[PDB]
Structures are given as C-alpha cells and as structure tokens.
Design a protein around this ligand. Structure first.
Ligand SMILES: CCCCCCCC/C=C\CCCCCCCC(=O)OC[C@H](CO[C@H]1O[C@H](CO)[C@H](O)[C@H](O)[C@H]1O)OC(=O)CCCCCCCCCCCCCCC
Ligand SMILES: *[C@@H]1O[C@H](CO)[C@@H](O[C@@H]2O[C@H](CO)[C@@H](O)[C@H](O)[C@H]2NC(C)=O)[C@H](O)[C@H]1NC(C)=O
Ligand SMILES: *[C@@H]1O[C@H](CO)[C@@H](O)[C@H](O)[C@H]1NC(C)=O
Ligand SMILES: *[C@@H]1O[C@H](CO)[C@@H](O)[C@H](O)[C@H]1NC(C)=O
Lengths: 98, 262
C-alpha cells in the first residue's frame, strides 16, 4: 500500500469574486481504489469532474479532480481523500495562493 | 521523442469481481480510454484512430476485446490453481508501447504494484527478484505460439506503424503552444505558472539579471485542459523582497518572457 499525496491549486490566478477552476491532484497511491471529494466550507461540492485513473513510471496511481470555483474573502476550499492506506480521510485545504 | 504508452489497470477483488480499465498516452496527451463498462475503445482526440482505416481499427479493437476477456479468465484460473497461496485482492498493471526517436517497444507487467514480468524478444520472462511461483505460468504462457507471434507483431510492427499515423494525424494538437500566466504570493516567495504547453519551461527568481540560486522548482502538476502548472519558490530574508522578480521563459511567448516584480 502507498499513501496518497494531495496538491490543491487553481487554474488561473485567484482573484476574489472571479470564477476560476480548482484542481486537486492526487498521486503516489496504491491500490487504485480511492474516494476523492472537493469541499466548499467543509461541504461536498457536487459538480466534481475526474480524469481517468492512470499511473506513473514507478507504477503508483494518479488522478486529477477539478471543479469550477469562485474564491472569495469568506470561503475555504479543500480536497478530501479516503484510501485504504489511511485510517481516516485525509483533507488538504487550498492554501489560497495556489 | 514521443513515448506511446498503453496502460492497463486490472483489479481482482475476489472470485467473480474484477475490472480492467485502460488509458493510452502519446507523450503527455491522452489519446484513448477503455473503461471496463465499455465494449469498445473510446477516442479522446479527433485523431485517435491515427492513419488506420475503419476496417483496420475494427480488427485491432476486436483483438483487444478478445484479449481483455482472455486475460481476465486466465488470471482468475491462475488464482484458482494457486489457492490458497496467492489470494485476492490482486492488482495487475500493464504498460505497453513504443518510443520513437527508429523505435523501441516495451511491455512491462506489475503485480501488487511491483514490476515482475516483461515481454522481450520472442517470449515472456519474469524479471530478477520476481516471485518464483510465477516461473511456471510464464513457461505455460510461452508455449502459446500464436500469442507470442501476435505480441511480437504488435510490439515490433503495429505499434510503431500506428504511432507514426498518430504523429501525422495529431500534429496540430501535439505541436500546440499555450501561453503561461504567472502570479506571485508568499519568508517564502512563490511564483505560480499555469496554463503552459508544451512542458519545457524555465521559471526563475531574479534580482535584475542575476538568477537567484535558491530557487526551488516544484513538481509539474497538470491542469485539466491539457496544460501544465508549476511553482518556483524562494526563501528570502524579510528585508529582501524589494527588487526581486519572477521570470518565465516558454516557447509560446516568442522571446517576450513574463517578468513579474515583487
Ligand atoms: C494500440 C491501440 C491502443 C488501444 C489499447 C487499449 C488497451 C490495451 C491494453 C493492454 C495491452 C496488452 C498487450 C497484450 C496483447 C495480447 C495480444 C493477444 O491478442 O493475445 C490474445 C490472447 C488470447 O488468448 C486466448 O486465445 C488463445 C488462442 O491463440 C489461447 O487459446 C489462450 O489460451 C486464450 O487465453 O490473450 C491471452 O493470451 C491472455 C492474456 C494473458 C497475458 C497477460 C500476461 C500477464 C502476466 C501475469 C503476471 C501477473 C501475476 C499473476 C497473478 C496471479
Ligand atoms: C521482434 O523483435 C525482437 C527484437 O527485440 C526479436 O527478438 C529476437 O529474435 C531473434 C530470432 O528469434 C533472436 O535471435 C534474438 O535473440 C531476439 N532478440 C532478443 C532480445 O531476444 C523478434 O524476433 C521480433 N519478432 C518478430 C516477429 O518480428
Ligand atoms: C467481492 O468484491 C466486491 C468488491 O470488493 C464486493 O462488492 C463483494 O461483496 C465481494 N465479495 C465478498 C466481500 O464476499
Ligand atoms: C468488468 O466488465 C466485465 C465484462 O463485461 C464484467 O463481467 C464485470 O462485471 C465488470 N466489472 C465491474 C466491476 O463492473
């Protein structure tokens, strides 16, 4: 088993009030079964689009989730991951710069 | 030097639960997907059939369709024969294709996330360090002359031929230029560079003309629109920010580098 790495970053420069796209790139996990949610104020964003699961040269899986989002002065965004390698869901928050 | 990679991911949970899903890449662009749910291989590009005729594409698909079924039955029969020695769940990965320069082909197989088997020359072989229980199923597989002849044909002939057709047909998408957009944030200073294509790029923190050596380049992270994202960070004394800039060079820019001053 390998534990997922999670990076959360935006497609365009984040500017408060302007629609943008948030990415959650999950890598370095095995086995391939995994649950990825994107969160707005800790609540699940329903429209989340996933790439096809693929894998790298070292055989570990990766997958990209993305969703439309509008950064504001008042909203937090996160990517939450459930995977057999971890006892609890692992959540990483968009650091608001990325 | 485009590497064409066909990636199969098969998960076997128990008796009679499994799935196989595949994706195909030409360099960093996805050209096909093949979902376990789908009877047929899906195109993810207008040019994903390359220079192959409808008829030739159809045959190549049917062979893959028989293969996906044969593969699944074979692995399930093997586990059955092995019991209880090899037990579910089982994860098999295949990475097959060719890299053009002339060309070279590969078919690598991993089991439980570890590289165990390759096709090389005219036969399947286990790789050094692979579990010894694999030696006998590989020997048996090797006696299937038809499969060996087919795999040799696919690796030696079909792959490079199909891919030269993809390169021609995909030329517009493969040779596309997308411009990066950069922004700064932060002590550690971050220069965010998003939306560029192709992958080669140069991102550096400068003080005037001097490259700042401590610039830590991050990983290339993909965007969902077949462009790339990169950050470059620099740890600076909270007295130094003044005068620093992020500079980006990229083929799409035409010599007009992005310079962003802090
Ligand atoms: C090129 C366009 C892109 C589209 C590609 C999308 C999907 C691509 C996915 C994968 C690529 C695979 C390349 C292989 C091609 C095979 C060619 C073919 O047609 O063969 C047909 C054959 C058809 O085989 C069948 O018919 C035969 C008649 O000749 C025989 O009677 C066989 O017994 C019967 O199974 O498929 C097979 O041989 C079964 C596949 C088993 C090979 C896998 C070996 C894996 C090693 C196991 C190690 C793991 C640990 C074990 C766990 C316990
Ligand atoms: C496909 O190419 C491989 C070369 O990678 C060929 O394998 C060689 O075949 C000859 C004759 O069988 C052997 O003497 C060599 O030792 C093989 N090379 C290796 C590295 O094992 C293979 O014959 C080709 N097959 C077809 C059908 O064209
Ligand atoms: C077989 O596999 C699938 C997925 O793991 C599961 O739904 C099914 O219940 C399994 N059988 C068991 C656990 O007995
Ligand atoms: C994968 O597809 C095969 C072939 O149709 C089917 O039998 C199997 O149930 C599928 N697995 C899953 C999890 O859907």
């Amino acid at each position: 088993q390998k534990t997922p790495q999670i990076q959360v970053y935006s497609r365009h420069p984040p500017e408060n009030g302007k629609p943008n796209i948030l990415n959650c790139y999950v890598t370095q996990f095995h086995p391939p079964h995994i649950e990825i949610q994107m969160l707005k104020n800790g609540k699940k964003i329903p429209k989340v689009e996933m790439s096809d699961m693929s894998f790298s040269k070292d055989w570990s899986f990766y997958i990209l989730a993305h969703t439309e989002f509008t950064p504001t002065e008042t909203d937090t965004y996160a990517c939450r991951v459930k995977h057999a390698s971890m006892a609890e869901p692992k959540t990483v928050y968009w650091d608001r710069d990325m | 030097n485009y590497t064409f990679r066909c990636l199969q991911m098969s998960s076997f949970a128990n008796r009679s639960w499994s799935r196989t899903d595949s994706v195909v890449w030409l360099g960093d662009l996805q050209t096909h997907r093949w979902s376990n749910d789908s009877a047929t291989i899906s195109f993810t590009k207008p040019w994903s059939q390359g220079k192959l005729s409808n008829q030739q594409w159809e045959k190549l698909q049917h062979m893959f369709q028989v293969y996906r079924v044969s593969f699944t039955r074979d692995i399930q029969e093997l586990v059955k024969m092995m019991s209880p020695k090899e037990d579910y769940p089982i994860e098999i990965q295949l990475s097959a294709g060719c890299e053009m320069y002339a060309s070279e082909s590969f078919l690598h197989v991993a089991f439980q996330g570890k590289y165990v088997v390759r096709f090389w020359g005219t036969s399947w072989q286990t790789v050094p360090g692979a579990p010894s229980w694999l030696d006998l199923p590989i020997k048996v597989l090797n006696a299937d002359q038809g499969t060996s002849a087919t795999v040799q044909m696919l690796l030696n002939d079909t792959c490079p031929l199909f891919v030269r057709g993809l390169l021609e047909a995909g030329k517009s998408d493969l040779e596309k230029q997308e411009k990066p957009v950069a922004w700064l944030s932060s002590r550690q200073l971050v220069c965010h560079v998003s939306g560029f294509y192709p992958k080669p790029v140069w991102v550096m923190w400068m003080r005037g003309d001097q490259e700042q050596q401590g610039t830590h380049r991050g990983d290339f992270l993909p965007n969902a629109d077949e462009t790339w994202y990169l950050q470059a960070t620099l740890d600076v004394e909270a007295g130094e920010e003044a005068g620093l800039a992020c500079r980006v060079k990229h083929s799409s820019l035409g010599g007009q580098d992005i310079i962003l001053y802090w």
